[PDB]
Design a protein around this motif. Structure first.
Motif: not given
Ligand SMILES: *C(=N)[C@H](C[C@@H]1CCNC1=O)NC(=O)[C@H](CC(C)C)NC(=O)c1ccc(-c2cccc3nn(C)cc23)cc1
Ligand SMILES: *C(=N)[C@H](C[C@@H]1CCNC1=O)NC(=O)[C@H](CC(C)C)NC(=O)c1ccc(-c2cccc3nn(C)cc23)cc1
Lengths: 304, 304
Positions: B78-103
């Motif tokens: 649904x969207x896309x944007x670049x942050x430094x050397x990483x690409x970021x794609x917005x999708x119409x569905x959120x991962x139902x297996x998404x864990x609690x995460x940190x960067x």
């Protein structure tokens, strides 16, 4: 590129680990369909483990004496039966995360991944080879019993090992998923000795192929040898016999690198009677025999 | 007992791996919530990778030029944007297996587990230390890019690394999950050199504590030393400086084994100027600096 000790992704096995508690002893179980598998010494006290009568102990237990817990929900035990050294508990719910699985009894020299668990929850994963004396050099604390070893074929999880015991020398012994121990060991807190161990020759040659694949080539000589002349040299260093079946397994690896199998044998023959002379192979000063030919192809071709 | 290189259970990360295909280049992505993360050189051809203009390349791409697939289902971009050397794609569905995460952006000397993936599917897991020169000694084939390194805190998955590149020397370089490379490297098929590497001293001392814990004790001498006298000896062998912060991290380990930190330093000082003299530590003829103090406690106490 690069070469590392690599374990299988443990996701499928993680969804099958449950905690089993009988009275006060607690360890891990394997929940596939509506049956949970765990070592039978779950039912022992601290004082029974030195010479237990598992048949006697299992009599005095009803279905309710067993506390199986998957997460923060309890699973109700509906039946129970013992198969050799493994206990089997029938529960009123089948695991919705049950993968396609198989029960295999692996051979000495083969490898597998170990998911070390405590209180029914995973703590880490590593790779182990089943030694020629039917032991494995693992890393298990108290309560690790019930942890399983496995291999993955595309989608099918092949369970092959369940941890039971640590020998006085620090190595570990266990059973397959039918309760049958690997080697001449029994589930009893008593002094036991494993047979004298040998070096898995095929795994050494496969490790040398991974070495050549990744640019380590100082050990390759211009010579060749015959299979019998290699075996008479290798055995005085306690290396396993190399048979025609063994040369046949190393076949595809010999084809990808262009080195004949018996040429690599002539290089290993030189390595054993001359040492490494200050050099390392794959950043290691010792030869390595815990990488099967299939392990090498997997890392150098990406089976996924 | 026993001591092994151990990786975290990869189950939570497995449910987040997706395949990303832009035109003809295919690699792996990280699907958390409704955003997929992947290296930005997904959009390059074979011929653009030698000196790419990622901003130029990203212009000519609409949301539909990206093919994200989780299993046998397609995810609509649904969207896309670049942050430094990483690409970021917005999708119409959120991962139902998404864990609690940190960067998190880890420090040199720390370790993490690497889930090596190809075509959005896991192939293996192993442990890596971030070298003082900001490289890692991994095992990556073509298409492995997008594979992530991580650590697990109870329930929270701490992502810290994403694979991008292999250096001419065989080591590997990557970024954090914000597109920021570790070290002075750029995502471009050109010759690059890492700084001269050093030995992580704290990890060596922690590995010696795991050695003592598991019965290997021939190297412990009766002497002690001061911190400064140890550093002047260790540096001529290219060992990292030992600071007070470092002694403080080794504290709890020194308490469990009863050996003062500076006593173990006096033993390491003797090891470097005298060698091992034919003996091995933990079945290894070389010292090991890829086990952090936290790694040792985890394996010798069972954090789970
Ligand atoms: C399972 N929960 C547990 C894991 C095991 C123990 C901690 N580390 C491991 O690898 N398994 C057991 O506790 C197991 C229970 C029996 C099968 C009933 N017992 C042992 O693993 C064990 C057997 C034998 C000895 C033992 C006996 C005599 C001398 C001796 N010297 N050392 C060293 C060990 C010895 C200890 C433990
Ligand atoms: C990701 N899919 C892939 C993984 C990488 C390639 C296979 N093994 C790996 O670790 N990454 C790339 O293909 C990456 C793409 C760029 C970031 C656009 N390129 C490289 O990893 C790469 C860079 C540089 C060189 C290179 C250059 C000059 C001399 C030289 N000598 N050797 C040896 C390598 C050299 C190769 C590859």
């Amino acid at each position: 590129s690069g070469f590392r000790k690599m374990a299988f992704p443990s996701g499928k096995v993680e969804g099958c680990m449950v905690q089993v508690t009988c009275g006060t002893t607690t360890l891990n179980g394997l929940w596939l369909d509506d049956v949970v598998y765990c070592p039978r010494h779950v039912i022992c006290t601290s004082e029974d483990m030195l010479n237990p009568n598992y048949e006697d102990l299992l009599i005095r237990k009803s279905n309710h004496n067993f506390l199986v817990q998957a997460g923060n929900v309890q699973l109700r035990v509906i039946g129970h039966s013992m198969q050799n050294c493994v206990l089997k508990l029938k529960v009123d719910t089948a695991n919705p995360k049950t993968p396609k699985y198989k029960f295999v009894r692996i051979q000495p020299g083969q490898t597998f991944s170990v998911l070390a668990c405590y209180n029914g929850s995973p703590s880490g994963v590593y790779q182990c080879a089943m030694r020629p004396n039917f032991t494995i050099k693992g890393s298990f604390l108290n309560g690790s019993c019930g942890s399983v070893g496995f291999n993955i074929d595309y989608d099918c999880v092949s369970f092959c090992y369940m941890h039971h015991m640590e020998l006085p020398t620090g190595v570990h012994a266990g059973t397959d998923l039918e309760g049958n121990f690997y080697g001449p060991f029994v589930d009893r807190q008593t002094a036991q000795a494993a047979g004298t161990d040998t070096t898995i020759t095929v795994n050494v040659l496969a490790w040398l192929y991974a070495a050549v694949i990744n640019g380590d080539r100082w050990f390759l000589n211009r010579f060749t040898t015959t299979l019998n002349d290699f075996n008479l040299v290798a055995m005085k260093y306690n290396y396993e016999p190399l048979t025609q079946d063994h040369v046949d397994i190393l076949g595809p690896l010999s084809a990808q690198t262009g080195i004949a199998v018996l040429d690599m044998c002539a290089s290993l023959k030189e390595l054993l009677q001359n040492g490494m002379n200050g050099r390392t192979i794959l950043g290691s000063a010792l030869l390595e025999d815990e990488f099967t030919p299939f392990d090498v192809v997997r890392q150098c071709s990406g089976v996924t």
